[PDB]
Scaffold this active site. Structure first.
Site, PDB file in Angstrom:
ATOM      1  N   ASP A  37       0.784  -1.424  -0.135  1.00 48.47           N
ATOM      2  CA  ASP A  37      -0.423  -0.050   0.033  1.00 48.47           C
ATOM      3  C   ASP A  37       0.949   1.332  -0.176  1.00 48.47           C
ATOM      4  OD1 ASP A  37      -3.217   0.646   0.293  1.00 48.47           O
ATOM      5  OD2 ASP A  37      -2.046   1.983   1.907  1.00 48.47           O
TER       6      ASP A  37
ATOM      7  N   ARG B 278       4.581   2.537  -1.936  1.00 49.24           N
ATOM      8  CA  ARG B 278       4.758   3.766  -3.080  1.00 49.24           C
ATOM      9  C   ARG B 278       5.934   4.315  -2.613  1.00 49.24           C
ATOM     10  NH1 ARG B 278       0.181   3.894  -6.074  1.00 49.24           N
ATOM     11  NH2 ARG B 278      -1.493   3.025  -5.185  1.00 49.24           N
TER      12      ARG B 278
ATOM     13  N   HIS C  25     -11.800   7.181  -1.388  1.00 50.47           N
ATOM     14  CA  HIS C  25     -10.988   8.273  -0.897  1.00 50.47           C
ATOM     15  C   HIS C  25      -9.558   8.769  -1.344  1.00 50.47           C
ATOM     16  CE1 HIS C  25      -8.007   4.873  -0.963  1.00 50.47           C
ATOM     17  NE2 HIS C  25      -8.467   4.231  -1.800  1.00 50.47           N
ATOM     18  N   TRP C  26      -9.222   8.487  -2.175  1.00 45.59           N
ATOM     19  CA  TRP C  26      -7.735   9.249  -3.335  1.00 45.59           C
ATOM     20  C   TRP C  26      -8.440  10.346  -3.076  1.00 45.59           C
ATOM     21  CZ3 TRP C  26      -3.854   7.203  -5.845  1.00 45.59           C
ATOM     22  CH2 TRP C  26      -2.931   6.262  -5.577  1.00 45.59           C
TER      23      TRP C  26
ATOM     24  N   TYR D  37      -2.089  11.977   1.673  1.00 39.49           N
ATOM     25  CA  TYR D  37      -3.081  11.208   0.212  1.00 39.49           C
ATOM     26  C   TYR D  37      -2.532  12.799  -0.455  1.00 39.49           C
ATOM     27  CZ  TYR D  37      -4.931   7.273   1.297  1.00 39.49           C
ATOM     28  OH  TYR D  37      -5.401   5.563   1.175  1.00 39.49           O
TER      29      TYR D  37
ATOM     30  N   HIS E 176      -6.417  -6.689  -0.427  1.00 42.30           N
ATOM     31  CA  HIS E 176      -6.118  -5.874  -0.316  1.00 42.30           C
ATOM     32  C   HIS E 176      -4.831  -6.364   0.336  1.00 42.30           C
ATOM     33  CE1 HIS E 176      -3.798  -2.391  -1.430  1.00 42.30           C
ATOM     34  NE2 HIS E 176      -4.252  -1.586  -0.156  1.00 42.30           N
TER      35      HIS E 176
END
EC number: 3.8.1.3
Lengths: 296, 296
Positions: B107, B111, B152-153, B216, B277
């Protein structure tokens, strides 16, 4: 007392429909003209421009079904009573209660979506139509990219399955309603609004069942309303009613709105107004001016 | 809080940008495991003993997450960019004497991991990513269906204090909704209850929640820009890569993950695992085996 009368000389009427009563402030005389509000407001949003139009028209300022003081019909799993299609049919029913089968219509935000859906489904009911600071629902979703998803995040957030948006909006409902009103103004604060008008929006947003229905509205806007728009665009159906499209120079519709609307209507004219999203309150004189000349 | 890493030591690693918490165990080549949103390092508790069989396993809280320090953010959310996160963890590794290590990310930390390999490839021997695609690829493929899927992004990226105000009303609900929605079963049954209490406690702090919104926000602006320069310049990751994605994960939706990762790296292997996920918790044995074989 709790809420102020912003429509002096206007009557207050409860119109009975199959799906529940609709509240409306009625005033003036002449040809009938329907004005619809949007999110997250009520009919009082029209209080600044309604007196000018009441000089030439019988102006009816109605709460959308489930909004303001109108009744809230029971929703279902496809959110049918809050689709723009069913909303338009309820409003057609209310107008018939008044004896108005052929009227002029002006819509803003969600109610503007009701207006162009009504014109798509029942052109014979309208003499002229005006939409303020919107593009068709199908057009919004089709242009969804990084930049626009950040701008109109609430289209996807409010459409999340219940009860997730209902729970989070309950965390601070006062803040959210005020954040939405200020974020879409050119000033970036609440200075454009009348303090008595904000109190109406505040009270309406404070009820948990009101917020549920507005979630049902955006859920319809992400699914059923998209599909109905999708059928028409593929079929080549255009709006035959003479149309006026007004958008704010810093509004949300800013695609080129007039070029977009030409694909959805045979006969449309358009003008930009120097404001943010809430044209009737930000620029009341300029909005009223464009409407009267078009409707007369 | 429960000890889910029996026999593991606990180290507080000092960096310029603040301390990093990590659970250290095993011996052999060094392997870094990073967690993501909305979890902490304890997410690795099912597979860490198995990898500790054969590696010196370091299970760290990301900067600003868990028990790590939270550096103050700025106008660009710089300390919570993936680029700045990567330098902080490189700093922590040097504290331990590890200048050339293996890394696996899930997750948000995934990144950080692929950003680390783009900026500092020489620091990594091998790299593994779990259930992600590059940030740029998420935004480029953003459409109606995907905007509803990963709302949610766009929601978490709204300017402060709008998400912080909404989350503060009932943070317990939100953290549980996000964990349940992303599992294949659609509930909390996959997780260990002691681990869930770790996630709940971490999410219960308002400053922690602000840091995750800042995460985010960086993912909505600076990190995309970082991804954009590399994708357009043709920069690829030279470190050998393994990509694991869930059959019901987020990466599988709206793309086929392996073809996407081939565009970003010279040498990539990939395998799907029947999970949601949260791979290390949903499918611990299957994930651990795939990690051990790749890193060995």
């Amino acid at each position: 007392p709790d809420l102020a009368d912003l429509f002096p000389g206007f009557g207050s009427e409860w119109i009975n429909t199959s799906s529940g009563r609709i509240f409306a402030r009625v005033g003036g005389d002449g040809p009938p003209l329907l004005l619809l509000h949007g999110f997250p407001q009520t009919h009082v949003m029209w209080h600044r421009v309604a007196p000018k139009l009441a000089e030439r028209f019988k102006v009816i300022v109605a709460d959308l079904p489930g909004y303001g003081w109108s009744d809230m019909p029971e929703s279902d799993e496809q959110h049918t009573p809050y689709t723009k299609r069913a909303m338009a049919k309820q409003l057609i029913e209310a107008m018939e209660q008044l004896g108005h089968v052929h009227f002029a219509l002006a819509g803003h935000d969600r109610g503007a979506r009701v207006s162009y859906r009504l014109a798509l489904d029942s052109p014979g009911r309208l003499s002229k139509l005006a939409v303020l600071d919107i593009l068709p629902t199908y057009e919004y979703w089709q242009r969804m990219n990084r930049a626009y998803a950040l701008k109109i995040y609430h289209w996807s957030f409010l459409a999340q399955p219940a009860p997730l948006p209902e729970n989070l909006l309950g965390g601070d409902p006062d803040f959210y309603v005020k954040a939405k009103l200020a974020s879409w103004t050119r000033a970036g604060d609440l200075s454009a609004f009348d303090p008595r008008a904000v109190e109406h929006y505040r009270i309406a947003f404070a009820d948990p069942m009101r917020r549920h229905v507005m979630c049902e509205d955006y859920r319809a806007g992400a699914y059923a309303d998209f599909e109905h728009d999708k059928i028409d665009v593929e079929a080549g159906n255009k709006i035959p009613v003479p149309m006026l499209a007004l958008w704010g120079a810093s509004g949300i519709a800013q695609a080129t709105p007039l070029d977009v609307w030409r694909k959805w209507a045979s006969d449309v004219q358009g003008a930009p107004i120097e404001s943010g999203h809430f044209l009737p309150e930000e620029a009341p004189d300029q909005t009223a001016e464009a409407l009267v000349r078009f409707f007369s």
